[PDB]
């Protein structure tokens, strides 16, 4: 409007609908659909199955962290001097404990997420928040004062961030095209494509 007399923006009729018009005459899709593996892992029906399918990721991350710390300890120890102690006995707890703690935290998160979703019966943000909060509570069992408040918050926030930018964002902005005519405005006289642009072939790596 760019005036001071009437409200800015506009209004669209709710009664009047515009019949959908295809973006192009022929649509070629270079985006592959989700794999059967993805759907299997995503299935939260059985909490135990869901947990056991998704823990490998947490275990791997714990193993990488433990390997990192163990290597740092091993690198410093001197080869030239003989050591009374056994290095593996010193280093094995590091890796084992890190992997176990990571797996336990990821198990708690996955279990609570599946159990809440089943009990509630709906896929919602709350399920992620309560799983994160429970994981952060387990993380901060014996930590000083600030940490009990901070970790349940950071952990609860992480599934919120994942849901907003991993699931809601793409579905929200699926229609936008970028070529031909703007999604909403097809009356405007813009070049109309016979086929959609294919910027890349479907990936295979």
């Amino acid at each position: 409007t760019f005036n001071y007399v009437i409200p800015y923006g506009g209004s669209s009729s709710y009664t009047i609908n515009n019949e959908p018009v295809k973006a192009e005459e022929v649509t070629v899709d270079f985006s592959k659909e989700p794999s059967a593996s993805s759907l299997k892992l995503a299935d939260k029906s059985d909490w135990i199955a869901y947990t056991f399918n998704n823990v490998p990721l947490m275990a791997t991350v714990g193993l990488l962290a433990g390997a990192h710390e163990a290597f740092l300890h091993y690198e410093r120890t001197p080869i030239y001097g003989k050591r009374t102690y056994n290095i593996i006995k010193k280093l094995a707890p590091i890796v084992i404990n890190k992997t176990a703690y990571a797996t336990l935290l990821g198990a708690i998160f996955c279990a609570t997420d599946a159990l809440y979703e089943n009990y509630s019966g709906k896929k919602s943000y709350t399920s992620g928040m309560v799983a994160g909060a429970a994981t952060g509570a387990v993380f901060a069992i014996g930590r000083p004062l600030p940490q009990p408040l901070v970790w349940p918050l950071v952990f609860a926030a992480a599934p919120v961030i994942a849901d907003l930018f991993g699931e809601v964002y793409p579905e929200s902005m699926k229609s936008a095209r970028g070529y031909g005519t703007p999604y909403g405005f097809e009356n405007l006289d813009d070049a109309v494509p016979t086929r959609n642009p294919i910027r890349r072939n479907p990936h295979h790596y």
């Binding site: 961030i161 994942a162 907003l164 930018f165 991993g166 809601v168 964002y169 793409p170 902005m173 699926k174 936008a176 970028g178 910027r199 890349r200 072939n201 990936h203 790596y205």
Partner: protein, 187 residues
């Protein structure tokens, strides 16, 4: 360090774009973006700041190039070359400041156009995680570039060697300032 951190990249980007060498995985560019930004912020030495900036940016550029945006990577590499030339061949504080600003992506300089091409490409693919990471990592990188600006004009008197060999350096600084308006069509 300057010639081998810029020139080699063009060949690899051309190979990737022309030979369809792209993967569905976004972990490597996301990692490069975050690691580079955090390491740039925690680095005391100025050479490490400049080296980690290239890691972060080339991670983002890798993510953009996998999705088919060849034109934007070829324009980015040229702007990045011109931006890096004046910071690396440091002789004048002003030339170095304009270079750091262009690498940072400030709008009056050509560096803004180069970063804009990548960011514009990112919004087309519509991946939320990449956009969020990009914004936060860019802020962290900006703090490192502000550190560089602080070191030159706000910390202590600065005396540098009089290496008066600015072959293309004056031209590069001019091309950075002036080039924004001609290349505005791209973005």
């Amino acid at each position: 360090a300057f010639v081998f951190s810029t020139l080699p990249k063009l060949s690899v980007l051309y190979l990737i774009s022309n030979s369809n060498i792209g993967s569905e995985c976004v972990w490597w560019g996301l990692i490069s973006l975050w690691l580079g930004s955090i390491s740039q912020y925690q680095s005391v030495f100025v050479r490490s700041i400049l080296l980690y900036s290239s890691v972060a940016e080339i991670g983002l550029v890798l993510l953009v190039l996998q999705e088919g945006f060849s034109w934007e990577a070829f324009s980015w590499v040229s702007i990045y070359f011109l931006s890096l030339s004046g910071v690396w061949h440091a002789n004048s504080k002003f030339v170095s400041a304009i270079s750091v600003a262009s690498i940072a992506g400030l709008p009056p300089f050509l560096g803004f156009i180069g970063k804009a091409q990548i960011l514009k490409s990112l919004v087309s693919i519509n991946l939320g995680i990449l956009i969020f990471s990009s914004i936060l990592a860019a802020t962290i990188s900006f703090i490192g570039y502000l550190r560089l600006i602080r070191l030159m004009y706000l910390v202590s008197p600065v005396k540098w060697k009089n290496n008066k060999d600015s072959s293309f350096i004056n031209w590069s600084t001019w091309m950075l300032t002036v080039g924004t308006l001609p290349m505005v069509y791209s973005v």
